[PDB]
């Protein structure tokens, strides 16, 4: 498996501007008859991918003139020129040089904005899912940028590990910002057998954690 | 509308079949090859192998060879791609694709077809609150929140106030907790709206024709 990489994850891109998305490849392109089946395909959310440029500069039919291809042997590079509302979508790129067919992890267009930090809010076990037993901690780091953030779910001092699901949203398409959540499921006697409970969430913003809490 | 057009959602347990069809429509089928691709959560798009109109014979990536099985009636212009056995790893959306014989990409998708394997049974979503208990206003803006907890299958719907509260909701990404799925989905409102108004949270899960209101009471 001709390994095909890409970076970045996520490219923070004002519209209007120019993007450019490179590919490499852990073997050569060159096919033995000097051909370079390097594609790139765009897929735009929760729809199908769609070829975009074939055999490393050549640009599939009706796919917008501001898109350009380059690279030779191993290094290959997409460029958009003025980015427009709807190239946003994962970029791939695949190659059939080689047998088999392999697709690199791709790339996702994200809008950039100011960056903010996370509206944190924390809630404990309501009256109802106690007299039957669990109880979910739940904290909401909502309408932050820039995505990453890391959750600690400090339990009365000490932290915990097994109970954590964290679950993320889209780059909201209002005021582009991502929101994230973490419920923290503890039984009735370990929630119970327990006082102070506080969720703490690092993010690039604060050099100090945002911490909030409730005390049993 | 040169489309390969694809079945439905399949929903299956562990150990059972399902057999995928892939329609040709608006060129010579026997001109291309049909392609099979796995896109799997949060993995790569993967190549499951191909088959070959002229001839009939199917090549297999390695991955995926003895257990999936590509069949194909030309005469009828559908493709097919058969699961025996099904393991709980095959939950992915696996995409038909045609490849062309001079430059070798693949152009014409189909629109995914979207396995789910999974030992549950239908089960109704528990729905909970969440209300700040006296966690006062750190700044003029309460968001309030509900944990529908529990479910199999997807989907839940999650609305507030009946759809008339939008600006301020943001529900979560289902993360299966042990067979089943869970959710939350928080609403922001001014602090002058709740607790003076009511702010009701209402979700729906049609599989199993459920439909629960819960209102936030202050706490
Ligand atoms: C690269 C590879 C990869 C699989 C190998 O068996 C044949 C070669 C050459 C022809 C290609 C094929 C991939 C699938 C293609 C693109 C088709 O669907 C028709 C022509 C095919």
């Known amino acids: 498996d001709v390994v095909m990489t890409q970076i970045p994850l996520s490219l923070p891109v004002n519209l209007g501007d120019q993007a450019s998305i490179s590919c490499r490849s852990s073997?050569?392109?060159?096919?033995?008859?000097?051909?370079?089946?390097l594609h790139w395909y765009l897929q735009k959310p929760g729809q199908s991918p769609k070829l975009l440029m074939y055999?490393?500069?050549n640009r599939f039919y009706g796919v917008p003139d501001r898109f350009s291809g380059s690279g030779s042997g191993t290094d290959f590079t997409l460029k958009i020129s003025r980015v427009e509302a709807e190239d946003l979508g994962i970029y791939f790129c695949?190659?059939?040089?080689?047998?088999?067919?392999?697709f690199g992890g791709g790339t996702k267009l994200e809008i950039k904005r100011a960056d903010a930090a996370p509206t944190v809010s924390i809630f404990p076990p309501s009256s109802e899912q106690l007299t039957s037993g669990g109880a979910s901690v739940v904290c909401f780091l909502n309408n932050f940028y820039p995505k990453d953030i890391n959750v600690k779910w400090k339990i009365d001092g000490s932290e915990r590990q097994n109970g954590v699901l964290n679950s993320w949203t889209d780059q909201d398409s209002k005021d582009s910002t991502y929101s994230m959540s973490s419920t923290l499921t503890l039984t009735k006697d370990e929630y119970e057998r327990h006082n102070s409970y506080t969720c703490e969430a690092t993010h690039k913003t604060s050099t100090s954690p945002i911490v909030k809490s409730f005390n049993r | 509308q040169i489309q390969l057009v694809q079945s439905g959602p399949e929903l299956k347990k562990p150990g059972e079949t399902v057999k995928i069809s892939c329609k040709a429509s608006?060129?010579?089928?026997?001109?291309?090859?049909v392609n099979w691709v796995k896109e799997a959560p949060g993995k790569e798009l993967k190549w499951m192998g191909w088959?070959?109109?002229?001839?009939?014979?199917?090549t297999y990536v390695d991955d995926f060879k003895g257990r999936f099985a590509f069949s194909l009636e030309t005469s009828a212009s559908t493709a097919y791609l058969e699961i025996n056995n099904l393991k709980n790893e095959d939950t992915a959306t696996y995409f038909c694709?045609?490849?062309?014989?001079?430059?070798?990409?693949?152009?014409?998708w189909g629109a995914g077809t979207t396995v789910t394997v999974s030992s549950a049974k239908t089960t109704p979503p528990s729905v909970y609150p969440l209300a700040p208990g006296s966690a006062a206003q750190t700044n003029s803006m309460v968001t309030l929140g509900c944990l529908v907890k529990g479910y199999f299958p997807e989907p839940v719907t999650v609305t507030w106030n009946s759809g008339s509260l939008s600006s301020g909701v943001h529900t979560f990404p289902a993360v299966l907790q042990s067979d089943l799925y869970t959710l939350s989905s928080s609403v922001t409102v001014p602090s002058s709206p709740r607790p003076s108004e009511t702010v009701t949270c209402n979700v729906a899960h049609p599989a199993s024709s459920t439909k629960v209101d819960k209102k936030i009471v202050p706490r």
């Open positions: 694709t045609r490849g062309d014989y001079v430059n070798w990409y693949f152009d014409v």
């Open positions: 608006g060129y010579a089928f026997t001109n291309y090859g």
């Open positions: 088959i070959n109109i002229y001839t009939g014979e199917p």
């Open positions: 055999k490393v500069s």
């Open positions: 695949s190659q059939s040089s080689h047998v088999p067919p392999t």
């Open positions: 073997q050569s392109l060159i096919h033995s008859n000097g051909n370079t089946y």
